[PDB]
């Protein structure tokens, strides 16, 4: 159903935008460097990816096409909520993807609200079964409100905070509505491995949720609520000046990814746009991502940056 909606409905934001359009990249006609010298290699969560890119979390045959491409290109990949795996270890055969992705970095996904019913061990089991290199918890009160699902988000930050110091790197992310600066403050003390701001502008899960319930978005404005990806990057970075940040949420082009990095991001993550190419097969997914990085490179090149790092600051507000 949710997969159906993302593929057939108007689930993207209609009024709010990532805000990246409000910034222009500083073009250096005389930055004097060679395109061949711009290196996208970037180490993330204890592994060296060939580009600062992560396939976004998506929730069976799609995962094998996504992963296969992740390996082929050398980029990371966040798995869909393995929440269903801790409930049916028999269903493990379908998230089994290491087979196609031997080396590729794989972030397992679970979602904070679950720490209210799962603990220390269960977690280890999940990262285990999947043979993941890390684990990501996603928070999403607005989505859950509109969906009318577990609507209780009390004391989840501490329940994590305590049982934290885990064997594998851990990161927190939203699902497209964004993480505010105060949200970043609430995480500043936990020893996280990284953060995914996943802001507004791309796919609105409040819309995806309503579309699943009515076959149309009945409360448009309610579903546009969120922190634009651009604002989220700036705000979160502002609070966590050193933790590696992932910009996701409508960062659908290489040029935009460059802007994302310039504003303070370290990694880019794309989800919905890969959903269709994933249905067509790994080759198609690899093609999509390949082209995205091909332009991210050219963008960094025109900016005068030799790598995702030197992009920082190379942008100005329109």
Ligand X SMILES: Cc1cc2nc3c(=O)[nH]c(=O)nc-3n(C[C@H](O)[C@H](O)[C@H](O)COP(=O)(O)O)c2cc1C
Binding-site residues sit at: 57-59, 81-83, 109, 143-144, 173, 203, 250-252, 271-272
Backbone φ/ψ region at 111: left (φ over 0), alpha (ψ -120 to 50), beta: left
Binds its own copies by CB under 8 A, chosen from 10, 12, 14, 33 = 33
Tell how far CA 155 is from the center of its chain.
Answer: 24
CB 122 within 8 A of CB 165: no
Q: Please give the backbone phi and psi of residue 111, each rounded to the nearest 5 degrees, phi first.
A: 95, 115
Local structure of residue 3 (DSSP, 8 states): H
User: Could you tell which of its own copies, ligand X, none binds residue 317, using a CB distance below 5 to 8 A set by kind?
Assistant: none
Binding range to ligand X, per CB under 6 A, among 20-28, 84-92, 123-131, 243-251: 243-251
Nearer to its own copies, 24 or 117 (CB): 24
**Which residues are bridge partners to 170 per DSSP?**
135
Give yes or no for residue 183 binding its own copies (CB under 8 A): yes
Please report the beta strands in 59-122, taking only residues with DSSP state E, as ranges in sequence order. Answer: 76-81, 106-109
What CA–CA distance (Å, rounded) separates 249 from 256? 11
What CA–CA distance (Å, rounded) separates 73 from 274? 14
Nearer to ligand X, 173 or 314 (CB): 173
Other CB atoms closer than 10 Å to residue 189's CB: what's the count? Answer: 11
Give yes or no for residue 138 binding ligand X (CB under 6 A): yes
Residues that bind its own copies (CB under 8 A): 3-4, 7-8, 16, 24-37, 61, 139-142, 144-146, 151-157, 174, 177-180, 182-183, 186-187, 214-216, 218-219, 221-222, 225-227, 253-256, 276, 279-280, 284, 295, 298-299, 301-302, 304
Residues that bind ligand X (CB under 6 A): 2-3, 6, 56-59, 80-81, 109, 111, 138, 173, 175-176, 198, 202-203, 248-250, 270-273, 275
């Amino acid at each position: 159903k949710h997969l159906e909606a993302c593929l057939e409905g108007e689930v993207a934001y209609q009024k709010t935008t990532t805000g990246l359009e409000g910034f222009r990249l500083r073009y250096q006609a005389l930055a004097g460097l060679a395109l061949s010298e711009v290196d996208l290699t970037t180490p993330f969560l204890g592994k060296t990816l060939k580009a600062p890119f992560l396939i976004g979390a998506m929730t069976e045959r799609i995962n094998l096409a996504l992963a296969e491409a992740a390996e082929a290109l050398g980029v990371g990949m966040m798995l869909g909520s393995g929440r269903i795996l801790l409930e049916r270890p028999e269903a493990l055969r379908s998230f089994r993807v290491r087979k196609v992705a031997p080396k590729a970095l794989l972030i397992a996904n679970l979602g904070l609200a679950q720490l209210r019913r799962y603990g220390r061990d269960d977690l280890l089991r999940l990262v285990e079964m999947l043979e993941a290199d890390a684990l990501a918890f996603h928070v999403n009160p607005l989505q859950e409100a509109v969906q009318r699902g577990d609507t209780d988000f009390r004391g989840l930050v501490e329940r994590l905070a305590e049982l934290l110091p885990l064997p594998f790197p851990v990161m927190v992310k939203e699902v497209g509505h964004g993480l505010s600066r105060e949200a970043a403050l609430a995480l500043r003390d936990l020893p996280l491995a990284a953060v995914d701001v996943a802001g507004a502008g791309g796919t609105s899960w409040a819309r995806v949720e309503e579309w699943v319930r009515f076959g149309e978005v009945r409360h448009p404005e309610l579903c546009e609520i969120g922190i634009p990806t651009a604002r989220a990057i700036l705000e979160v970075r502002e609070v966590l000046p050193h933790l590696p940040l992932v910009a996701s949420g409508g960062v659908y082009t290489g040029t935009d990814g460059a802007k994302a990095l310039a504003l303070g991001a370290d990694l880019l993550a794309v989800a919905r746009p890969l959903l269709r190419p994933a249905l067509e097969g790994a080759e198609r997914v690899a093609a999509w991502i390949g082209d995205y990085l091909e332009e991210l490179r050219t963008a960094l090149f025109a900016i005068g940056a030799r790598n995702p790092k030197e992009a920082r600051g190379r942008v100005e507000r329109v």
